[PDB]
Structure formats: C-alpha cells, structure tokens
Amino acid sequence: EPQRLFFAIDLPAEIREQIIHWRAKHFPPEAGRPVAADNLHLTLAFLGEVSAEKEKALSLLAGRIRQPGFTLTLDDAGQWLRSRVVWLGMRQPPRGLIQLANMLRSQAARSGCFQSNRPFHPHITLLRDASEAVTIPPPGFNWSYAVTEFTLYASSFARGRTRYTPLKRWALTQ
Numbered sequence: 001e002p003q004r005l006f007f008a009i010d011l012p013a014e015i016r017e018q019i020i021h022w023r024a025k026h027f028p029p030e031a032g033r034p035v036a037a038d039n040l041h042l043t044l045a046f047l048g049e050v051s052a053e054k055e056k057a058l059s060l061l062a063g064r065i066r067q068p069g070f071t072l073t074l075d076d077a078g079q080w081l082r083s084r085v086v087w088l089g090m091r092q093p094p095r096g097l098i099q100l101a102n103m104l105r106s107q108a109a110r111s112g113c114f115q116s117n118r119p120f121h122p123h124i125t126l127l128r129d130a131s132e133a134v135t136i137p138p139p140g141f142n143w144s145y146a147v148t149e150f151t152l153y154a155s156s157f158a159r160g161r162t163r164y165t166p167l168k169r170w171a172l173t174q
Ligand SMILES: Nc1ncnc2c1ncn2[C@@H]1O[C@H](CO)[C@@H](O)[C@H]1OP(=O)(O)O
Pocket: 006, 043, 046, 085, 124, 125, 155
C-alpha cells in the first residue's frame, strides 16, 4: 500500500506556540493559509509515493545513520513567491543538520525516489498560498532548541485537513 512519506525534524510545543503567536501578530488572515500548529516541522527529505518494500528498506538505511544531536536556532524568516510560502529558517544551518539531510537524501536517491532537483534549503513553512509579497519581520527571540531525533512521517489529506502521521522515530548521538 503506497504512501506519501517524508523525513522531518519536529518542534517542541513551547516553540510551536511562540511561532503561531508571532504569526498571528504579523500576518493577517488575507496574508495566506496558516499551517496548523501540530503540522509545523522542518523537512529533511521528501520521498513521495513509496511502496511498503521500499519503506522497509529506507527505514533500515535510516537506522544505520549514526550522527550526534545538534542545536537549531531560528534566526531567519522570509518568503518564496514562486512557491507562495512564508517560512521560518536559519542563516547558518548547523553542519549536523546538513549532514543528516544530504545523507537521507542520498539514501532516497539510491532507493529510487525522485529528488528535489533543487538545493536543500532548510525551512519551516508558516503560511501557504501566500501569493502576494508582504513584509517579513525577524523571528521571535530565542527560538533555540536541542534536536534529539528525526521522524519518518506519512502525509495524508482527509476531512478538509492535512495530517502527518508518525511511522518511526530515530534518536541521534546513538
Ligand atoms: N512534491 C512534493 N509533494 C508534497 N510535499 C512535498 C513535495 N516536495 C517537498 N514536499 C515537502 O513535504 C512536506 C509535507 O508535504 C512539506 O513540508 C513540503 O515542503 P514545504 O513545507 O516547503 O511545502
């Protein structure tokens, strides 16, 4: 049974709450469609439609990953007009995050998944279908936290909402 799958880093609740609070303050309803608080995340690699056999194999390669934890500090925000999103990010992403993503991306490639075709730009999407350009303030203060694991999610749309179901999790620092 095929699924739309992706690996992602998650956000502690305290920070998810600070973000949606910041967003509501600086972005009115007309600015775009706001991502649900529980759906806020940072994608490491989008795998697309994947069979069970390939999910198994990918899940195993991910299990072979051996990488220390690292810290994320969200100091950057912006807007991609072509994609029509407003995103949260980082000016200088930690190497550990880049390592983790490229490795997962290379495992996806060798597994026969369809690649980004674009460089990896780590980001958390806040607003979707934000067509028109709007002024982007800096993020809030001290949105910094420790990354202890990564998660394989399944993407599902149902009942007029997008849902992310966790399938498996992997701790870092082994
Ligand atoms: N072709 C694609 N179809 C669906 N999601 C994709 C995708 N390519 C990348 N993604 C990412 O997969 C995640 C879940 O769908 C999203 O965070 C999305 O990134 P985005 O937030 O920048 O849009």
